[PDB]
Design a protein around this motif. Structure first.
Motif, mmCIF file in Angstrom:
data_model
loop_
_atom_site.group_PDB
_atom_site.id
_atom_site.type_symbol
_atom_site.label_atom_id
_atom_site.label_comp_id
_atom_site.label_asym_id
_atom_site.label_seq_id
_atom_site.Cartn_x
_atom_site.Cartn_y
_atom_site.Cartn_z
ATOM 1 N N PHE A 149 0.808 -1.177 -0.026
ATOM 2 C CA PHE A 149 0.104 0.012 0.123
ATOM 3 C C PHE A 149 0.732 1.233 -0.002
ATOM 4 C CE2 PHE A 149 0.244 -0.953 4.539
ATOM 5 C CZ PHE A 149 0.457 0.272 5.099
ATOM 6 N N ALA A 150 0.331 2.341 -0.639
ATOM 7 C CA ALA A 150 0.918 3.705 -0.551
ATOM 8 C C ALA A 150 -0.176 4.438 0.580
ATOM 9 C CB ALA A 150 0.725 4.301 -1.674
ATOM 10 N N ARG A 151 0.473 5.262 1.385
ATOM 11 C CA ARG A 151 -0.411 6.128 2.209
ATOM 12 C C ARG A 151 0.262 7.506 2.357
ATOM 13 N NH1 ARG A 151 -0.829 6.208 8.225
ATOM 14 N NH2 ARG A 151 -2.920 5.768 8.847
ATOM 15 N N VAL A 164 5.442 4.450 1.086
ATOM 16 C CA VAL A 164 4.925 3.067 0.550
ATOM 17 C C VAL A 164 5.675 2.104 1.101
ATOM 18 C CG1 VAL A 164 5.017 4.113 -2.008
ATOM 19 C CG2 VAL A 164 6.940 2.935 -1.115
ATOM 20 N N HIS B 134 -3.576 3.798 -5.819
ATOM 21 C CA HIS B 134 -3.739 4.906 -4.821
ATOM 22 C C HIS B 134 -3.241 6.185 -5.638
ATOM 23 C CE1 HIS B 134 -2.769 6.845 -0.720
ATOM 24 N NE2 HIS B 134 -1.893 7.317 -1.629
ATOM 25 N N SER B 146 0.278 4.515 -7.120
ATOM 26 C CA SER B 146 0.870 3.257 -6.547
ATOM 27 C C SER B 146 -0.005 2.044 -6.738
ATOM 28 C CB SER B 146 1.624 3.598 -5.211
ATOM 29 O OG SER B 146 2.027 2.187 -4.543
ATOM 30 N N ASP B 164 4.928 2.391 -9.654
ATOM 31 C CA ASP B 164 5.144 3.674 -9.101
ATOM 32 C C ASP B 164 4.967 4.552 -10.272
ATOM 33 O OD1 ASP B 164 5.456 3.570 -5.895
ATOM 34 O OD2 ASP B 164 7.077 2.162 -6.887
ATOM 35 N N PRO B 183 -6.240 10.482 -0.861
ATOM 36 C CA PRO B 183 -6.146 9.990 -1.990
ATOM 37 C C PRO B 183 -7.373 9.559 -2.621
ATOM 38 C CG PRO B 183 -6.122 8.281 -0.291
ATOM 39 C CD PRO B 183 -6.130 9.696 0.500
#
Lengths: 211, 212
Positions: A149-151, A164, B134, B146, B164, B183
């Protein structure tokens, strides 16, 4: 609601920190709480950094699927090790370990944070919240789930601080029969109530295959 | 449905490939199709590797929220770095033109570091699976993406990668998504009709902030 006990110990740029506490979680509504106090005075960094550190057992899973983290409590359990890369070069190595004492989950988490520049956002209190994530989960074998996951954190000025996360969940006694024909997705969000000494989260977790 | 034109060129461990074709997209359905044919004979690698290469314009976004298909224009570029579990790396750049109510893409890929016994030269990939990307902004002009992705294998296993992305927007070009509190997530899935010489996709793209 299952009772939660939690301890986090670690280093951020060599600076030691530790906190203890707990709360309650109920897998049925995919909600958990956790409040923890520092045992070493005020944190040298944003308490928001630790929200996603301070229990996958408490996520809802879609109709024909069982939460494999919830399931593993009764068979060997699981560990989680994450590598979290932050946009300013900061890196968090986080390890999650669990023991279970009859309807109560105990977390012993270790974090190692390195490479945040002196002008890093985490040393500046501009982080006002963390935002939602959707983790992509798939098995690499019978015993391993790989997560990605990206956050983001929202900043006081309106901007974003992003990272990430690549996770490896190593199970002891084979993951639930889902396993296995594509990924599972875990939507997460938090409500945060932090000082530099006392941190608190409400977290919601809902897994799905299709939105 | 808006018309789609597409070209894809590049190298996989040096081996040159070129595909050309096109299809149709309906942004309100979040559906598009694309059919392309190789111009340099049969591919030396799995045609399924190109599925997520052969148009974000055709994605639904929730109650406005618009979709930066806003361009219009004036458009965007996408650059992706894709890291595969075998050690393989795909570098992919996405360029677009808009001539007369249709979208034309010229995509470039560089594939490197795929080992000789890589899944991609083997035929065991039977499909690619769904993703949720995301998306968050980096200062008005850049959207950062991502997503991890898997192919399912004939043996029932998985071949996976992470991506990415950097979407550079010419002239901002985000209202509903710039001022968003967090997001956007984009759910995507495909249906593939590949032969090794002739490639076909139906793609679904649906964005959301929650749930689901």
């Amino acid at each position: 609601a299952m009772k939660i006990e939690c301890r986090i110990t670690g280093t951020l740029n060599g600076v030691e920190f530790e906190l203890v506490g707990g709360g309650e979680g109920t897998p049925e509504q995919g909600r958990m709480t956790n409040k923890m106090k520092s045992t070493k005075g005020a944190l040298t960094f944003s308490p928001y950094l630790l929200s996603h550190v301070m229990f996958y057992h408490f996520g809802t899973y879609p109709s024909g699927y069982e939460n494999p983290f919830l399931h593993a409590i009764n068979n060997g359990g699981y560990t989680n090790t994450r590598i979290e890369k932050y946009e300013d070069g900061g890196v968090l190595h986080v390890s999650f370990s669990y023991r279970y004492e009859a309807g109560r989950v105990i977390g012993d988490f270790k974090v190692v944070g390195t490479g945040f520049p002196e002008d890093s956002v985490i040393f500046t209190d501009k982080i006002i919240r963390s935002n939602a994530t959707v983790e992509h989960l798939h098995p690499m074998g019978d015993n391993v789930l790989v997560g990605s996951f990206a956050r983001t954190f929202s900043l006081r000025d309106g901007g974003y601080y992003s990272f990430v996360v690549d996770s490896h969940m190593h199970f002891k006694s084979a993951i639930h029969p889902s396993i296995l024909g594509g990924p599972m997705f875990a939507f997460r969000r938090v409500e945060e109530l932090h000082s530099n000494t006392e941190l608190g989260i409400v977290e919601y977790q809902h897994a799905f295959k299709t939105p």
